[PDB]
A paper describes a structure:
For these studies, we substituted the PyAeADHII enzyme-bound Zn2+ with cobalt and measured the spectral properties of the enzyme in solution, we obtained the crystal structure of both wild-type (PyAeADHII-WT) and cobalt-bound (PyAeADHII-Co) at 1.75 Å and 2.2 Å resolution, respectively, and determined the co-crystal structure of the NADPH-bound form (PyAeADHII-NADPH) of the enzyme at 2.35Å resolution. Four molecules of ADH were found in the asymmetric unit with each monomer containing its own structural Zn2+. To confirm that the metal-binding sites in the wild-type enzyme were complexed to Zn2+, a low energy remote data set was collected using the same crystal at λ = 1.2480 Å. The structural studies show strict homology to other mesophilic ADHs despite the high thermostability and the lack of a catalytic Zn2+ ion. PyAeADHII contains 19 proline residues of which 14 reside in coil/loop regions of the protein. Notably, the proline residues in PyAeADHII, TBADH and HADH are distributed throughout the protein whereas in YADH, the prolines are localized in the N-terminal and central regions of the protein. This distribution of proline residues in PyAeADHII may therefore contribute to its observed thermostability.
Numbering used by the authors:
A (entry chain D), B (entry chain A), C (entry chain C), D (entry chain B): -1 to 331
């Protein structure tokens, strides 16, 4: 039993090719998912490019996916064949200090391991995941496939920012997969939301439909400072802008896609203004349930740009960088 | 100089009468306000009715008002004649533990004294208040006059409820002045908002327009339980309903208009479900600024019913008890 | 195929019932629409009440709706499955004197027939309409569903009033579906706009956000006369209070919802002041395109009160007459 | 009795000198105005330069002014000493075909004579004008002085263009005195307004505050064609670049300041697209009242660059041609 998959034997986008792979089988506590849609994210790009080591090798990437349960492993209850599911992408033990306080993405036993990085991922017709990671959903699976990275990372960022109604929130990288949900969550929490894009002219309507009160270029954002919160899911790419626009008590919530991100930090400005720089990665297992429910209720929206077949995975990854891309790129195995 | 005012020398609606009164004059730290609109609230009704002691006597009630600065007291700066203002209604010292942590409504020195209860109030052409209590505003003053009690009290309740996006929030008394802002603030903070009214057949749509996701009768609320949060500004009037629909970790935020309110509390159900019963009164001075800005920005809505002249203050207080429709009743001196 | 619909076999609101009905099939020149939102208007109420004879019987009402094309009939091009559309509600031939001069609502061949009155309408999951009546739009369909009656009728009234910048325009019934757009169009054309409402305090803020320069009661309008234009979408309801506020050269533009509208006209005042009484119904097909584009550009606004499910259509229609209501009621099949 | 005035005995700005002149006295039907502010316009520049013959000689120019009535001649009513007034600048008889149909700027008896061209004008402490040309105003006279030429010419252009809401209007010379009001009036009538300027980068924010939806260079406007209306107050200066941007039924409204303005017109393109080329000069006496009321109401705005004393009249005239001028130059005698 074979399946189609995109895999690399050595890092580099040039090495990501369509192959035939043995179809995996679920053991105890696991489910086999027929992948319907997989998200295309900076994280997946950087994994393929070798920013971090993947296992196993040769490696199928794809850390964000949704699909239909094909086979439940032994002992598995609560999910059966035919169930549409979307996959929480962190392996977690459920028994360590981090898991027991809800921070499952920080699990001490698995090391925070990400499905599709330390296991084979969703750029394939089938994938095996822990049954407790598969969340049943009534949402359209194209839309649900924007949740495990894009929406959940943005939720976790906004949660860790302590946004109060009235507060001015700048979202850097607001056109990106995480950023566009960060606009939505910051507005859902009561923020006055300023979405930052160099493409303001072209993307203004999309970002306002996501809840932005204003769409500013980076240079316009500097004139609109100060901000109470900056949500910046781009690593170090915009550090100078993000840090400088914060006011007293400002919170800079930082997330990234695992590229190197060393920056110059002025501690004196940080302590003089009582700024907090707040790291965020992934999201809590409980919050993933909340995000799925918000999507089902129409309270958040999935902004989609294009869907590619598996054979076009290289083209899909390169589309991340296209100036005409506004919204999510998906793979349909 | 003399002015027109509504005053009572002894309690009872029957004894509230339009009189001539000496126009007050502002001392150090004070401003004289030409009152443009004053709200008609249960608190004012209960003050006139004698359920709470007022001073001085004979007494001019009116704890919620907006107007134009007529005269600034000796030394007063930052507030000028002609400025339109809306009045924070708690006297606060700024130096005690409560004031210094931001809980100005809990001031240990003034005892939380409410303007128009321990001072002469706004049911008069002119009122004297502390200059630090007068907030300049560009909002229409009829809408501003809904903020000092209705909006601020609701803001404070929702703030004290720790509403997280996705949580199920029930608002009891949702058709009242506080309750209709509580609907708005629960939605502003990300709650899934269920407005509860015996009068759902008549008020469903107006409450949806305030932000409710659904409107339920009490019996429907019991069927839709559990709720994560109940916001109940009606004192003890719906205690059994509000307490019994809470689920695990539920927060019941309670506020009222100073009438007697003893209830039967089952501590075993409270601790078995880890419920919190949370008292709320007034609001923080800082939060009053935020509420004013939110109204000026159009992020919250003033639901108004009718404006009465001062000579019809008794008909205005009766309209509060038996309303032709939902919304704030105002007096215009 | 069967669909859910609200239908009546005999007039009366109590006879309007949820039924299963045969899903219609589009014939030549027609499209099948999956209705997303349908407006609730006085006209729909009067159809259900029997003030207006409807065909066929039993009858599915609903003359204002927007949705997504499901199927194109034989010979149809320019429109395909998936297209969001909003429906011009007048049947027109395109070849008569009226159609060829642009007055498609006055078509001599169809007799002006109104979709949902002489055809089955939009209070159902699906509806068939002429392909040339379906306008593709990128607007939110909830907002687009306010255009076929409310906005278009108001546009046609304002267009027929010859409003010049500076002219004083009174809008009666200004909070109704048509009236609230008539405020907007009178301001868009340069008029000085006085919205007339006896509920002044309740509705002043929404009417100012619609473009009113002032909100007056009917008695204040009498004191503020003369006006150059009255826009009256209320049939005969406001005539006796309003005709007398017009000055020399004044234009009284009348529209309505097909109930009886007999009034007494003082002809000597009419000719002595060179007043014009101008009938207005529906709107021109070309102007419907303009109105759609204005909504897409954010130059006009939909003011929404509540959306009901199809099962609650009776409550939706009764809400039309509610004292609590301000703004548009929609049905979502 | 003597006054200061700027007068020229021979054409050329270098010959416009401050002199001591006999203060005029008002005859029957005339008022003496103490000039407070006089506009500096291309027309005034071209009168001084000799492109337009003036009388009497030596000549006091200045065709656009506002001031205070100092003295009423015999038979003046409805205009009294002390009244702030702004002056309609066309002499008109009130009894010819043109005056009796409203086109007072086309008066057959006076020949369209312009105050300050065929009479001594407002670049002096005092000027005599017909009482019926003086309009009392409560607006600031510095802003009123922008109306007799700049605003009224723009009004008459936009009126003659039959602008309908939604129509695309290009304004050439949008930074000029007429053009900046043409932007406002085109927007006031509901047009989608594109302001054309080679100095786009520096004037963008000002033209947007005047109502422009976009600010384009001439070459950018070619790419945005077709337009329904071009408003061109610059004579022949922009014709070759602008006539071709018009679409079907387009209207090209032309005004100017009396210099040579011969152009090449392709009649075949004109009749093939049913284009109209529409001459506009001055404005109607009735429309001047409307424009004054619109300024008093804040519906139009005076955009001012600088005010100069009468001694600096030569600097003020040359500032018309400065690349750094954005807005009106005034003289204050
Ligand atoms: Cl991205
Ligand atoms: Cl209506
Ligand atoms: Cl100019
Ligand atoms: Zn763990
Ligand atoms: Zn204190
Ligand atoms: Zn026809
Ligand atoms: Zn004449």
């Amino acid at each position: 039993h074979e399946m189609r998959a995109a895999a690399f034997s050595t890092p580099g986008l040039e090495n990501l090719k369509l192959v035939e792979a043995e179809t995996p089988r679920p053991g105890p506590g696991e489910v086999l998912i027929r992948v319907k849609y997989a998200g295309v994210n900076p994280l997946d790009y950087n994994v393929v490019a070798g920013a971090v080591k993947a296992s196993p090798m040769p490696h199928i990437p794809g850390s964000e996916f949704a699909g239909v349960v094909e086979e439940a492993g032994p002992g598995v209850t609560g999910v059966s064949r035919g169930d549409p599911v979307v996959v929480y992408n962190r392996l977690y033990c459920g028994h360590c200090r981090q898991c027991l306080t809800g921070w499952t993405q920080m699990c001490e036993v698995t090391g925070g391991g990400i499905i599709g990085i330390v296991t084979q991922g969703g750029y394939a017709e089938y994938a095996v995941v822990p049954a407790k990671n598969a969340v049943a959903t009534r949402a359209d699976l194209k839309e649900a496939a924007t949740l495990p990275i894009g929406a959940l990372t943005a939720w976790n960022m906004a949660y860790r920012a302590s946004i109060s109604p009235g507060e001015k929130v700048a979202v850097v990288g607001a056109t990106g997969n995480v950023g566009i949900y960060a606009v939505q969550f910051a507005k859902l929490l009561g923020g006055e939301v300023y979405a930052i894009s160099r493409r303001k002219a072209k993307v203004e309507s999309i970002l306002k439909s996501a809840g932005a009160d204003a769409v500013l270029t980076p240079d316009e954002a500097k004139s609109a400072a100060p901000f109470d919160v900056v949500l910046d899911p781009t690593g170090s790419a915009s550090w100078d802008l993000s840090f400088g626009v914060l006011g007293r008590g400002g919170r800079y919530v930082t997330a990234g896609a695992l590229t190197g991100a060393e920056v110059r930090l002025d501690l004196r400005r940080l302590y003089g203004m009582q700024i907090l720089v707040i790291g965020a990665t992934g999201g809590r297992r409980a919050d993933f349930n909340t995000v799925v429910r918000l999507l089902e209720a129409g309270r958040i929206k999935a902004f989609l740009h294009n869907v590619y077949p598996l054979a076009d995975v290289r083209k899909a990854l390169e589309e991340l960088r296209s100036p005409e891309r506004v919204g999510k790129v998906l793979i349909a195995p």
